[PDB]
Design a protein around this ligand. Structure first.
Ligand SMILES: *[C@H](C)[C@H]1/C(=C/c2[nH]c(/C=C3N=C(/C=C4\NC(=O)C(CC)=C4C)C(C)=C\3CCC(=O)O)c(CCC(=O)O)c2C)NC(=O)[C@@H]1C
Ligand SMILES: *[C@H](C)[C@H]1/C(=C/c2[nH]c(/C=C3N=C(/C=C4\NC(=O)C(CC)=C4C)C(C)=C\3CCC(=O)O)c(CCC(=O)O)c2C)NC(=O)[C@@H]1C
Ligand SMILES: *[C@H](C)[C@H]1/C(=C/c2[nH]c(/C=C3N=C(/C=C4\NC(=O)C(CC)=C4C)C(C)=C\3CCC(=O)O)c(CCC(=O)O)c2C)NC(=O)[C@@H]1C
Ligand SMILES: *[C@H](C)[C@H]1/C(=C/c2[nH]c(/C=C3N=C(/C=C4\NC(=O)C(CC)=C4C)C(C)=C\3CCC(=O)O)c(CCC(=O)O)c2C)NC(=O)[C@@H]1C
Ligand SMILES: CCC1=C(C)/C(=C/C2=NC(=C\c3[nH]c(/C=C4\NC(=O)[C@H](C)[C@H]4CC)c(C)c3CCC(=O)O)/C(CCC(=O)O)=C2C)NC1=O
Ligand SMILES: CCC1=C(C)/C(=C/C2=NC(=C\c3[nH]c(/C=C4\NC(=O)[C@H](C)[C@H]4CC)c(C)c3CCC(=O)O)/C(CCC(=O)O)=C2C)NC1=O
Ligand SMILES: CCC1=C(C)/C(=C/C2=NC(=C\c3[nH]c(/C=C4\NC(=O)[C@H](C)[C@H]4CC)c(C)c3CCC(=O)O)/C(CCC(=O)O)=C2C)NC1=O
Ligand SMILES: CCC1=C(C)/C(=C/C2=NC(=C\c3[nH]c(/C=C4\NC(=O)[C@H](C)[C@H]4CC)c(C)c3CCC(=O)O)/C(CCC(=O)O)=C2C)NC1=O
Ligand SMILES: CCC1=C(C)/C(=C/C2=NC(=C\c3[nH]c(/C=C4\NC(=O)[C@H](C)[C@H]4CC)c(C)c3CCC(=O)O)/C(CCC(=O)O)=C2C)NC1=O
Lengths: 169, 160, 161, 48, 160, 160, 161, 160, 161, 161, 160
């Protein structure tokens, strides 16, 4: 949608300037990590259909308060819908990992997500834990794949946490 | 960019990132250091390109400069060099992005309605950017002038 | 506001006529059960801080809104939710004696939808709470006035939906 | 049209009167008269 | 009504209803049968009230029939007897509603500026309600005249 | 009293007191020879109401009698009957007043402060008061407890 | 603002005694003559803008005090002293129902002495106006309640002179 | 954090941050490794704290556990340990942030409206924090007990 | 309102867990760059009446806008234009001291289309004033601190257009 | 806000020029009618309860907009409607005296078309009221000043419609 | 003007205009035929005034045009003579209004905050205006000395 390149375009377009020395060195900082971005995005989709299955069984073994008849993950009508609604958070985290910033996450998944889940009774709470379990379970397959890891590939994920979850402090 | 265009196509089919667009993107990002030292030299010589293509346009189209044309007078022909200053400035955004969605969203999609509303001939700009291409291929080396010259050749197809 | 007499009166005032016998029939039915409601209003105001405790432990406590992430996790935001339910017990008991849901309309439910949607307050948990509260007041007042008190609770959950 | 507003927000308002005499710039200038730009301020002096 | 004073004067302190004010609710729904018989009899002879209390009003204040006054001619006195029928109807609302407030909102809070903009005297209609209460308390019973005559007494005592 | 609440309400409207409310004082004075039997019956059972409603409260909440609550010991259960007797020494001040104006200014206005300041939870205090006003309703008649029990049950919602 | 009912309540709690036998016949004296007061206080409101018709027209209307030079000669000083007489009637009728002059020295008699010596108001004209309005009420409530209204009228004139 | 309340106290005065408060920020950032060592030793013994302070609360107040009061079985006593687990978690958040504003916006605004609806004593929560203070300050170092215990008293000022 | 510290301990509160080693590393990434910001916030605070002075002379002065027919012509409009610029330095130093542009979404980007459109303020001169102000600020504060400050100037004008 | 002198200053201020010989005759046409408008206002204010009386007597009285099935019917809504017609006349005195309709566009025409749909009062009767107010006024003041008062009458009617 | 604030003083009380200030409007409009005659004399010799008010200023305070001062340069005086030329435009606006609010709304309100920012001294521009006052009152006769010098006084006393 809006790349880290194209975010730096309308960071410079609206002031009407060319590409100066700061433009030529911030953009080179994106390109030196681009080999590490793409190969991390391959191994995230190595077992991405397994990666949601290992996360949600580790979720629901951690919060039973979502299996026994309470909050909505009760039937397989809910549970297989939960695995799909989990799988969007894994799939859109692949895009913004390649795209540099989180503006793909900003206007594809985040907008309306506080208002979709409130209309259904889906809690926003364990969804943050569901991305928080996918926070480190994505870093394992990058680590076991030999990719270095760091803020890139561990950021898209907390931008799905710090902007989806409501501010307490 | 290409990286937006590879996501947005893969988002529409609602699959993951394919092995196809994993290698279009990886081949883009290992050419990323090559395109910025193309796009710096356009911005490093922006006062020469505008002056040379400004010298190259007005001898090709003397109906513009002559009175009763649109760019007539020293305030008006200073704006037509500013009118070409933007399109050189936009092309450097397209060389860095690897596509023309900086060109498309900023400098293409309403051009013919605007230039009809300003009085200028639309095809006279299409000669000028084509004259702007003929000084930009004399800057670069040969294997890069095919890459950066294609972004000039896209802008001709939007005008005419 | 508006009252069930002052809605029967104002129906026959904008027509300009005098008191019709159908309107007189519409005032005797308010006066026949007026002695029931006046005893019903005291028994809720006795237990008004008690009912909300018996309501919030019926459907909200030990659940996923008073747990990390929900809108009642922050314990000085859950204190809003108790006095948010103090309003809907107070103004419904106002509307029981009024004979009219017009207390709830232009005072409570006029901008209630826009407040909750501008905060991320769950609508579907509020209707989960208020319909749980309707069972508790009907247990305390009896099944006679619980039909009467159940109407104005259902007016709250309808306009909020 | 709802809008998700924060925990603490400041609506930005325009001083009906002098432009610099907003209280967000100088809080020690809010006790002043607004002068000819603002509305007419009334006060009670003469009691009968 | 009885609730409309009590549901507002306890909402403003944001408390529940005090059981002294629940006496006021109890205090009447036992009187609602007695409050309904009297307004049925008031409406049931509403033609005899206006034709009698309108009649000897002009034996008491003959100025408004006289030329130079407002209600000169039968085309204005029948317009004048509309306000007698309006105020008779507003009595019968206030007896049934139980207290002071519905006659106050519909027919009282503009009458010093309605009647001044009409040019009519504000005191002379206040003479007529005392004759409208004279013929009404002459035809009803004795025990309700301490009730129904006092709802007349408010719209006297805030008119003049 | 109900006389006192009516005249301060009529001062706010800056008019005389309404004929809707003048029914109520007239209804208060014909029931002024009805309220006094409730007052004398609480004289004859004030050693019986409090001594039963304590054990009714201590079987409902026996956290008080455990060592650590705010009334543990024989010197400390003195006040947990004396503060209950003090609330029985408040209703008979307002049975014959009709309403809650001696109930507030002696009992209610800072009662969230001082029981917190003495460490006693008011939810236990309101429980025995609720345990008190089940026995006093059974002692009185069915018509007496129909209105005084509504007047009894103000204090439980007012305290907690 | 407190009545005779609250006053015997005020003098009973403070010494540690209950609602004794001697307080009841103070209340039963209120409950005996309280039926007289509701017959009294309605008829004053029938003539509340008609006592002030007679207030000027007996002792103030065609006198030398209204003649240019006196105190009651201005239109800002005329209409300020009909409301200043109308308030003295309305607060008397509150005390007519209170059984107590303890609404007078809170809202009427608080600053009323010094505001007449400073504003040039003659004291003798008011007590020739207020005591003149005692006997016109004696023709409107009957014989006995005007003597009850004459207590608070004299409590005005004891608290004005 | 300490950045936030050095801004919202400098925004009310509507001027910049003076260097009288910038040095305390400058001493805060260089002392970052000290507070993590306070926090990790605090959260590393989270079962040593609550199992000890839960006993010391119940010796100070045995009436929560005795039949009649609040917490029973291993369910309602366990959620009493959940709230002490929250406040142990909520006090290590202000230690890392260096300010009492993250414990403020979560738990120093409004529980005196809240705990009275829950039926728990407010002051008996505060005796649980003083047992939590004496356990953690005995575990922590001699100098930082005057710093970590400088947040423990702030919870006592919230409830009591 | 939050900063780099209170975004970490907000996002790690709401998962229910304590502060962990993945989030402490985010705090140490802020604590490694904290010493750079306090040197940066000090030097701007000593030159707040001078960064505004040069940047107005960089792009705004001797233009159409300074001249009559432009917007900042009247002295009354002119001072305001310094004042409506001086919030853009003070709130940008607050977000530079925070490490989060959450102040800038909250205090200084609310009405910033609708105030400036309903006052005749051109948007396109304010964006040109701000990167005229960013160039003199990054020259004053250094190359390393200039790009951290350069995020929060380009956060403002991207949200302002 | 502004008048015929302040506007022609503000028309000649934002051009940057002085007062030329093309704007002095805008002042000289104002100062020639300066004595005409001040005599026009002093007969408005002496008749201001009769211009509003004769305006409603041709449009609103004895119709069925003051019927019980009507908008005007309750006397709360009558005395507002004379007063909502008072504020159309009194500001029309002002703009004639100022020579510019800018005071009408600030306070009268603030949100008046959007209040009236939010209230439910008809607009098509209001243009019938002010155009009945226009024919009363021009007969009273004079056919010179009734022409310039007729512009500022219809400028309200241009804004309502 | 007088008329635009006699409106506002009468609008905020919601009254019509008193006839005392209707004398003030009527005396103003017959003074309009002579006040514009003052303003035509003032704009007819602006270049005789501004050149002379510059040379009466720069002899008095020679530090501002000597280098090291703010108005140093060939063109920097030409803005600073233009910056004093603007007050001659406004005084001719203040002459034809009979008032000082076109001086106030245009040339007073933030004049301390401009020259603090630009660096010119605020009294040094005020001494040019009294130097401009000495020549412009020498342009006119006796009866136009005080009527022009009063608005010259108000711009001096506000800036200084
Ligand atoms: C194995 C012999 C037995 C068994 C074990 C089992 N099941 C699960 C997980 C789930 N079971 C359900 C069950 C249902 N969903 C429905 O809609 C219905 C019809 C009403 C039923 C009975 C669901 C939703 C789950 C997934 C969520 C969960 O964890 O409970 C597990 C856990 C698997 C894991 O560890 O991931 C186990 C061990 N299921 C059987 O059918 C046998 C009786
Ligand atoms: C499962 C781990 C969690 C959970 C999931 C859950 N979700 C739903 C329903 C929906 N989720 C979405 C979300 C999106 N749609 C989008 O387009 C995007 C951006 C790409 C997102 C994030 C939507 C729209 C729905 C509604 C159904 C639909 O998809 O059309 C349910 C179903 C609710 C039900 O009971 O019917 C569930 C269970 N709930 C949990 O408890 C887990 C935290
Ligand atoms: C509680 C069971 C539910 C709930 C409550 C909740 N409410 C708020 C915030 C507000 N609630 C109101 C309520 C009203 N405003 C009205 O005018 C009326 C009619 C009388 C009512 C009932 C308002 C105005 C606010 C917000 C203003 C403010 O800043 O406090 C919160 C706070 C939300 C937050 O994040 O701050 C909460 C938690 N939410 C639930 O989850 C329950 C379903
Ligand atoms: C224990 C030492 C004391 C005590 C605890 C107690 N609490 C509850 C119920 C609740 N407590 C809370 C409090 C918080 N929730 C939070 O998220 C936070 C901040 C992070 C706080 C301070 C809330 C919201 C509830 C209600 C639902 C829930 O449990 O979350 C109970 C149960 C009461 C009941 O009736 O069920 C108990 C026992 N009470 C005591 O007596 C001790 C003094
Ligand atoms: C709901 C409250 C309410 C009332 C009661 C009311 C009365 C009312 N009186 C009217 C006129 C009038 N009413 C009167 C009445 C009187 N003047 C006198 O001298 C006597 C005191 C009195 C009758 C005995 C007169 C004389 C007119 C005509 C005024 C005129 O012609 O100028 C009209 C307009 C004529 C019409 O519509 O037919 C109404 C609507 N309007 C209201 O909105
Ligand atoms: C609710 C209790 C209460 C009372 C009774 C009261 C009286 C009162 N009377 C006043 C004045 C006045 N009172 C009078 C009185 C009279 N004129 C006469 O001819 C007679 C002597 C007397 C007949 C009643 C006059 C003339 C003034 C105004 C003084 C003046 O003219 O300047 C004023 C000063 C303010 C004013 O009205 O201008 C008060 C406060 N105020 C109260 O709050
Ligand atoms: C941070 C919260 C905040 C906001 C958003 C804010 C905006 C703001 N800008 C304003 C004015 C203004 N602002 C300008 C603007 C400028 N000068 C220029 O030449 C440039 C084109 C432009 C900005 C660089 C003008 C030209 C006026 C109008 C002052 C007036 O007419 O009263 C005004 C009106 C002045 C007043 O208060 O009366 C406000 C409120 N003030 C605040 O405290
Ligand atoms: C000059 C600045 C200014 C404006 C704009 C102003 C407007 C104004 N006119 C209003 C009402 C009103 N306007 C009318 C309209 C009319 N009367 C009629 O009967 C006819 C149908 C119609 C005109 C011919 C009515 C009936 C109301 C009262 C509405 C109501 O009370 O429900 C109201 C609502 C006030 C209220 O009802 O409480 C406002 C604010 N007041 C002001 O000071
Ligand atoms: C009508 C309302 C109004 C005022 C008040 C106004 C003031 C004004 N004076 C200015 C400059 C200036 N003004 C001066 C003035 C002086 N130097 C001195 O030493 C003397 C004391 C003094 C004048 C006698 C100088 C030197 C500058 C240029 C400042 C610079 O370029 O640094 C500028 C900036 C240049 C421009 O934008 O054109 C403005 C806006 N303009 C207006 O439209």
């Amino acid at each position: 949608m809006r790349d880290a390149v194209t975010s730096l375009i309308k960071n410079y377009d609206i002031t009407g300037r060319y590409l100066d020395r700061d433009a030529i060195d911030s953009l080179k900082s994106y390109f030196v990590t681009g080999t590490a971005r793409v190969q991390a995005a391959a191994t995230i989709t190595a077992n991405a259909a397994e990666l949601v299955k290992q996360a949600a069984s580790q979720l629901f073994g951690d919060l039973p308060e979502l299996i026994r008849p309470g909050g909505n993950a009760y039937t397989t009508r809910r549970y297989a819908a939960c695995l799909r609604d989990m799988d969007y958070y894994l799939r859109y985290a692949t895009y913004a990992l390649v795209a540099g910033d989180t503006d793909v996450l900003d206007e594809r998944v985040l907008q309306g997500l506080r208002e979709t889940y409130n209309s259904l009774g889906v809690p926003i709470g364990p969804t943050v834990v569901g991305i928080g379990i996918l926070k480190d379970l994505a870093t394992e397959k990058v680590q076991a794949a030999g990719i270095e890891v760091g803020a890139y590939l561990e950021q898209p994920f907390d931008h799905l946490i710090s902007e989806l979850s409501e501010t307490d402090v | 960019s290409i990286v937006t265009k590879s996501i947005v196509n893969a988002d529409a089919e609602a699959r993951y990132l394919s092995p196809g667009e994993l290698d279009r993107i990886k081949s883009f990002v290992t050419s990323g250091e090559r395109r910025v030292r193309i796009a710096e030299t356009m911005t490093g010589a922006r006062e020469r390109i505008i002056k040379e293509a400004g010298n190259q346009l007005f001898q090709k189209r003397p109906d513009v400069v002559s009175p009763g044309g649109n760019a007539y007078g020293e305030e008006m022909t200073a704006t037509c060099l500013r009118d070409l200053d933007y399109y050189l400035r936009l092309i450097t955004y397209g060389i860095v992005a690897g596509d023309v969605t900086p060109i498309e969203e900023i400098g293409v999609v309403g051009v013919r309605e605007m230039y009809k509303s300003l009085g200028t001939p639309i095809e006279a700009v299409a000669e000028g950017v084509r004259a702007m291409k003929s000084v930009a291929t004399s800057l670069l080396s040969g294997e890069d002038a095919a890459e950066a010259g294609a972004y000039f050749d896209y802008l001709i197809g939007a005008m005419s | 506001m508006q009252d069930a007499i002052t809605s029967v009166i104002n129906s026959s005032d904008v027509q300009g006529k005098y008191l019709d016998a159908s309107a007189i029939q519409k005032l005797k039915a308010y006066f026949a059960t007026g002695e029931l409601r006046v005893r019903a209003a005291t028994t809720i105001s006795a237990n008004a801080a008690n009912i909300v405790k018996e309501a919030v432990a019926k459907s909200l406590l030990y659940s996923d809104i008073t747990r990390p992430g929900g809108n009642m996790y922050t314990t000085r935001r859950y204190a809003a939710c108790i006095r948010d339910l103090d309003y809907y017990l107070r103004y419904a008991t106002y509307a029981m004696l009024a004979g009219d849901p017009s207390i709830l309309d232009e005072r409570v439910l006029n901008g209630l939808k826009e407040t909750y949607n501008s905060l991320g307050v769950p609508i579907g948990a509020t209707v989960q709470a208020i319909q749980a509260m309707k069972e508790v007041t009907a247990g305390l007042v009896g099944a006679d006035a619980g039909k009467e008190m159940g109407i104005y609770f259902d007016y709250i959950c309808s306009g909020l939906s | 049209r709802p809008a998700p507003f924060g925990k603490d927000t400041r609506r930005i308002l325009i001083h009906n009167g002098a432009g610099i005499d907003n209280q967000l710039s100088n809080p020690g200038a809010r006790g002043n008269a607004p002068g000819s730009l603002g509305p007419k301020v009334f006060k009670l002096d003469q009691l009968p």
